[PDB]
Design a protein around this ligand. Structure first.
Ligand code: HEC
Ligand code: HEC
Ligand SMILES: C/C=C(C)/C=C/C=C/[C@H](OC)[C@@H](C)[C@@H](OC)[C@@H](C)CCc1oc2c(O)c(OC)cc(OC)c2c(=O)c1C
Ligand SMILES: COC1=C(OC)C(=O)C(C/C=C(\C)CCC=C(C)C)=C(C)C1=O
Lengths: 178, 378, 48, 105, 53, 60, 75, 53
């Protein structure tokens, strides 16, 4: 479900064709208003913990706007995610999973890695079953669990004067309207 | 793209109160600016609710104020909140000026010069306000302070009678003093905005007097919350005074109705005029005494021209620290003398304190700054 | 001289007790936010 | 070689310690008032001296907020106080006064 | 004419915001009742009783 | 997870509307309990003295 | 008219911060707090106090002198 | 200390602006006299006479 939600927010860079019309509200707003060079969402997994969020690269006068729009998307998905965009995220994940397991090498990695982490190979038909179960209610539940009113870890490098203060990043993790 | 950032009205609020880069750094001495704003709206709000029941005629003015305090549902809190808020307004003013003097904040010429106008305007407003309940202190307060104009040669008499409405303080004097006292806080409010506009051009000074662009923090949430706490202390200080000692800072003589035939034996200003009062009466000359009074407050506008030091703040200037405190204690001395009768020890020590006030600012503090420069090989 | 006398002292006790709650509470609110700055650590790492 | 110049130096060291900018790890030239002469001298400073200056001022404004002070070992010793801004400032003052001499003619 | 905002997504978006809008009404009702000391409603409330007997 | 600040947060503080509702409901019951207490303290520190304690001397 | 991202130039400075919810509002409030106020007092007493005692002496003397002057003896 | 503004050019610049500053004083004197009906000066003026005889 977190991966579905991350797919809805997606990725962007400056070489993506057609910016304005992209489905992701973040990617669309970032392209139109020249808010960044790139962003990526991620879900890095370790044993019993991980790092769930995003990274971006932008001009010095754009960090505030980027952070605002990113956080708004997290908040939107917690509170008011809808059926149609969740289908799009589901589809993006089926397409990512299948397109990744393509070649001897990524499949061999997946056999090797999966037996260390899950102790089985989880077959492709199981993932599809797990993807299919995800709807808007699941995205709202699962995003709220990890994102809503939680303390982020934040890392900043470069021209970062306009990087919002941590209290104001913390305040971006809930909504007063909800 | 933020609604907070681009909406033509919220823009103004955001660039003043939310996203405004402020020093990491500024102490409790920086709380008095917001506290003056709180004081301004407190006085506006209570003053409005007092205006709803006050009548500005000589026959009835004392009666209306006591009608407020006895008959009007909770008229007593409103009246004494107003009275003690005016004194709160002065405690905050004096702290705010002294902070500016100490920390070299006067180097913001326009902000400071507008501040000097704000001091004079709030002084004139509060003089008018005290005239309104038409007690004994009201009448002679109105007499003496209006008569200061009579020291302007050739035209001063015509001027005093021009603002009086006739040959003496009368029916005409009180009705216009209500009108002047009503509008002037709104004029003050407008000048407070221009004061803030000139300030935002530079942002704030800080305790070190060193530029703080290297370490700015957003006004919200840090100085929004520090300001709330500071205001809650202001409410304590105010509500201690209205609820436990409502008349501590006023005069009992203003509880007897005005009487044009008898000036009381004991008469002194409101506590916050006592230093300037002490300065004027230390001079046994009409023109010189009022010229010294004008100069005792208008001097603040010379302070930027007399800054000799290669540092802005007094934080790293011990000679100047000593002489600053000599200035505060001398001002405390002058308010003590203001409180006392014009008799033997008090005449001389008040004369010496007057001289010291002007000598400290004009001569002794500029020389301290040069010595301090020379000691740092500067 | 002062018919309000008993009412002002009643509100005064309420004022003191309220302020005895609100002053430490707003203090904690202000300290909680100032936490991020008051415990911050700086390092200077210039090249070469 | 003078007892009296050692005396003036000892009053100066006394004043230095009393001033107490060294308690925050500041140098003298960190504390100077930023006028137009001074802002230009700062502009003229080489990379290393610029970056050292900002950190010292950062460290001081940080301490001044905490209302705390450096361990005594880390106070700037008066003898070790580098007058790093002064030569640039003298040159900026020297250039302005030349302009003002030309404006007179 | 308002037909822009009629379709399956806006139906879901309204459904999501319904518990919240209900709770903001519940906030405001009690807040009005508390601010005015609304006698009609507060007579029911089993411990808030300024009127004797 | 047994702890009470946790269940206070989980049930009431997590949502801002529930947070506001718990404040306004909280303010109603505080106003009663504080005015009950602060009057009873003021009345006890002024044992007879007030017209509430004098009342019974002059009849029904 | 000053905005974050336009203030000044800073290079090579790392800032470590903690969340408000990770840390205490009153970390070591009396244990470190009291030693500090005493240190701040020591630092400033010689600059602040001596004008106010100088007020106090002139106050005490002035009140006393005024009191004594409005008494007679041999007349 | 004001010694910046002392030299041959500023002496010429003051000399240039003197007829103008004189005329602006002459403007302001008459304007004050006119606005107040300054009795002291206007008694001299051979036709402006509101007072009889
Ligand atoms: C004669 C000097 C003076 C007077 C009187 C004065 N101001 Fe100021 N004020 C200043 C200066 C100088 C600053 C800049 C302080 C600094 O940055 O250190 C300032 C700063 C402030 C600030 C914001 C920063 C701070 O210091 O808290 C506010 C708000 C304020 N003034 C409002 C007012 C109000 C309201 C009044 C009363 C009508 C007033 N001031 C009276 C000179 C003064
Ligand atoms: C909307 C009109 C209004 C405004 C605004 C106003 N007041 Fe007043 N003020 C009054 C009236 C009416 C009275 C007379 C009642 C009274 O004496 O308390 C009064 C009384 C006073 C008094 C005499 C207090 C006393 O009773 O001894 C002072 C002092 C005072 N005002 C100062 C101020 C100051 C300072 C401000 C803010 C710059 C201000 N007022 C704002 C209408 C106003
Ligand atoms: C329409 C015309 C207007 C509004 C003219 C306004 C002029 C206002 C002034 O400047 C703003 C003024 C208030 C200001 O002077 C600098 C004060 C600090 C003066 C302090 C003052 O108080 C007194 C006072 O309060 C009294 O009564 C109890 C009686 C007094 O004599 C015995 C005085 C008095 O002798 C002085 C000097
Ligand atoms: C950059 O420094 C500033 C502060 O930091 C110490 C403040 O706290 C405030 C807050 C001031 C208030 C609430 C008074 C407003 C006055 C009127 C007449 C509406 C302002 C504006 C400011 O500029």
């Amino acid at each position: 479900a977190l991966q579905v939600a991350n797919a809805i927010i997606g990725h962007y860079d400056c070489t993506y064709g057609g910016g304005a019309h992209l489905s992701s509200p973040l990617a669309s707003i970032a392209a139109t208003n020249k808010l960044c060079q790139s962003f990526q969402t991620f879900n890095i997994c370790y044993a019993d913990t991980g790092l769930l969020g995003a990274h971006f690269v932008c001009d010095h006068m754009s960090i505030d706007d980027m952070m605002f729009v990113l956080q708004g998307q997290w908040m939107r998905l917690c509170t008011s995610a809808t059926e149609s965009e969740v289908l799009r995220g589901k589809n993006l994940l089926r397409n990512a999973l299948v397109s990744h397991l393509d070649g001897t090498t990524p499949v061999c990695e997946d056999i090797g890695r999966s037996l260390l982490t899950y102790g089985r190979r989880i077959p492709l038909a199981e993932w599809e079953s797990r993807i299919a179960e995800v709807d808007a209610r699941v995205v709202r539940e699962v995003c709220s669990k990890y994102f809503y009113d939680q303390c982020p870890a934040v890392a900043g490098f470069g021209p970062i004067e306009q990087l919002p203060d941590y209290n104001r990043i913390r305040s971006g993790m809930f909504w007063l309207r909800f | 793209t933020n609604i907070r950032k681009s909406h033509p009205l919220m823009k103004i609020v955001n660039n003043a109160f939310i996203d405004l880069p402020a020093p990491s750094n500024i102490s409790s001495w920086w709380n008095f600016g917001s506290l003056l704003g709180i004081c301004l709206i407190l006085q506006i709000l209570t003053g409005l609710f007092l205006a709803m029941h006050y009548t500005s005629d000589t026959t009835t003015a004392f009666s209306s104020v006591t009608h407020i305090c006895r008959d009007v549902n909770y008229g007593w809190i409103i009246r004494y909140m107003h009275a003690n808020g005016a004194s709160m307004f002065f405690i905050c003013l004096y702290m705010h000026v002294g902070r500016g003097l100490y920390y070299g904040s006067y180097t913001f010429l326009e902000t400071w010069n507008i501040g000097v106008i704000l001091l004079l305007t709030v002084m004139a407003t509060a003089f008018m306000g005290y005239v309104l309940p038409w007690g004994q202190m009201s009448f002679w307060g109105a007499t003496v302070i209006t008569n200061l104009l009579s020291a302007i040669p050739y035209i001063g008499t015509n001027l005093v009678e021009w603002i009086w409405g006739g040959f003496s303080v009368d029916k005409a004097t009180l009705t216009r003093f209500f009108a002047f006292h009503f509008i002037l806080p709104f004029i003050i409010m407008a000048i407070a905005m221009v004061h803030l506009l000139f300030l935002h051009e530079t942002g704030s000074n800080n305790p070190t007097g060193i530029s703080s662009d290297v370490d700015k923090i957003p006004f919200h949430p840090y100085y929004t919350i520090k300001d709330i706490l500071g205001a809650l202390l202001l409410i304590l200080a105010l509500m201690l005074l209205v609820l436990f000692a409502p008349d501590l800072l006023g005069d009992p003589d203003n509880y007897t109705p005005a009487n044009p035939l008898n000036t009381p034996p004991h008469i002194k200003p409101e506590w916050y005029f006592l230093f300037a009062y002490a300065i004027l009466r230390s001079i046994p000359n009409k023109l010189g005494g009022v010229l010294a009074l004008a100069f005792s407050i208008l001097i603040l506008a010379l302070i930027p021209l007399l800054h000799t030091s290669k540092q802005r703040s007094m934080m790293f200037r011990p000679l100047s620290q000593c002489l600053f405190w000599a200035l505060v204690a001398d001002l405390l001395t002058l308010t003590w003398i203001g409180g006392q009768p014009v008799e033997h020890p008090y005449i001389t020590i008040g004369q010496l304190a007057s001289v010291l006030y002007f000598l400290l600012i004009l001569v002794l503090m500029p020389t301290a700054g040069t010595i301090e420069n020379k000691l740092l090989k500067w | 001289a002062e018919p309000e006398h008993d009412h002002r002292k009643r509100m005064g006790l309420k004022m003191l007790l309220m302020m005895g709650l609100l002053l430490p509470l707003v203090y904690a609110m202000k300290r909680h936010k100032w936490s991020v700055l008051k415990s911050r650590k700086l390092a200077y790492r210039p090249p070469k | 070689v003078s007892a009296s110049s050692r005396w003036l130096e000892g009053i100066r060291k006394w004043y230095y310690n009393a001033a107490g900018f060294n308690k925050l790890g500041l140098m003298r030239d960190d504390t100077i008032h930023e006028n137009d002469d001074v802002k230009e001298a700062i502009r003229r400073l080489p990379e290393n001296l610029y970056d050292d200056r900002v950190f010292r001022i950062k460290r001081a404004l940080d301490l001044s907020m905490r209302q705390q002070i450096l361990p005594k070992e880390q106070w700037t010793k008066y003898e070790e106080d580098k007058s790093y801004l002064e030569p640039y400032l003298k040159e900026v003052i020297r250039e302005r006064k030349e302009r003002e001499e030309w404006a007179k003619k | 004419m308002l037909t822009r905002f009629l379709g399956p997504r806006y139906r879901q978006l309204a459904r999501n915001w319904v518990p919240t809008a209900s709770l903001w009404g519940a906030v405001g009702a009690v807040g009005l009742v508390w601010a005015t000391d609304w006698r009609l409603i507060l007579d029911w409330v089993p411990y808030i009783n300024g009127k004797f007997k | 997870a047994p702890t009470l600040t946790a269940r206070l947060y989980s049930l009431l503080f997590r949502r801002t509307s529930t947070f506001a509702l718990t404040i306004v409901v909280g303010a109603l019951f505080f106003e009663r309990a504080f005015d009950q207490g602060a009057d009873a303290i003021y009345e006890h520190i002024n044992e007879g003295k007030l017209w509430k304690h004098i009342k019974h001397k002059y009849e029904n | 008219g000053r905005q974050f991202g336009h203030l000044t130039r800073v290079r090579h400075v790392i800032t470590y911060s903690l969340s408000p919810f990770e840390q205490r509002a009153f970390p070591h409030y009396f244990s470190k707090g009291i030693p500090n106020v005493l240190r701040r007092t020591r630092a400033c007493i010689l600059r602040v106090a001596p004008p106010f005692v100088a007020f106090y002496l002139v106050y005490t003397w002035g009140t006393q002198e005024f009191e004594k002057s409005k008494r007679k003896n041999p007349a």
